[PDB]
Amino acid sequence: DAFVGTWKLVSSENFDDYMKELGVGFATRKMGGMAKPNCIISVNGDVITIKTESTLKNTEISFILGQEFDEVTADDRKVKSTITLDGGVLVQVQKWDGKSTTIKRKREDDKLVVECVMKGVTCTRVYERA
Ligand SMILES: Cc1c(C2CCCC2)nc(N(C)C(C)C)c(-c2nnn[nH]2)c1-c1ccccc1
């Protein structure tokens, strides 16, 4: 399983615009923009865990594929999230207040590539094994 590992952010495109679309205020966008998180992905049986570690904020989710769960996001949104596997890509949708965002996690070569979309905005974040 190409996703298991500890992954360090190495590049990011359009993350500020994405955060704006999420409703994140300026001071918090400022901190989030300069963060270089680690993403730690593990699996045991049916249960996938994704841990994000950074100096300004840590988060953790554990989920079963196809099973909706409640999540509090890093920016404090209370969302309903569902994550499925579609041709080897982990696809997560977060829904709240009639809005939604999609986060796709893909393995490409040596990279974990994460594409985040909300409205017209597409952010791409690349991570490499720690
Ligand atoms: C929404 C979000 C936030 C919010 C809090 C600050 C304002 C935005 N911070 C993150 N960082 C930078 C770490 C420090 C928690 C990440 C993030 N999580 N992993 N890497 N980056 C994400 C995120 C990125 C892409 C896909 C899903 C979630």
Q: Residue 73: CB within 6 Å of ligand 1? A: yes
Residue 18 annotated as binding site: no
Which domain, by its residues, includes 98? 5-128
Nearest to 123 by CA among 5, 24, 53, 4: 24
Question: Using the 8-state DSSP alphabet, how is residue 63 labeled?
Answer: E
| Integer angstrom CA distances of residue 40 from 8, 76, 93, 94 | 9, 20, 19, 20
**DSSP code, position 109:** T
CATH number (domain holding residue 25): 2.40.128.20
Ligand 1 lined by 83 (C-beta under 6 Å): no
With beta carbons less than 8 A apart as the criterion, state whether 33 and 19 touch.
Answer: yes
DSSP 25-53: -HHHHHHHHH---EEEEEEETTEEEEEEE
* Distance (Å, whole) CA 65 – CA 46: 8
Q: Is 112 in the pocket of ligand 1 (CB under 6 A)?
A: no
Q: Are 127 and 8 in contact (CB under 8 A)?
A: yes
Helix residue ranges, H only, the chain: 15-22, 26-34
- Closest by Cα among 26, 90, 89, 96 to 81: 96
Closest residue CA from atom 27 of ligand 1: 103
Distance (angstroms) between ligand 1 centre and the Cα of 66 equals 22
Structure tokens at 106: 């893909």
**Domains identified in the chain, total number:** 1
- Find tokens 């796709």 and name the residue: 104
Method: X-ray
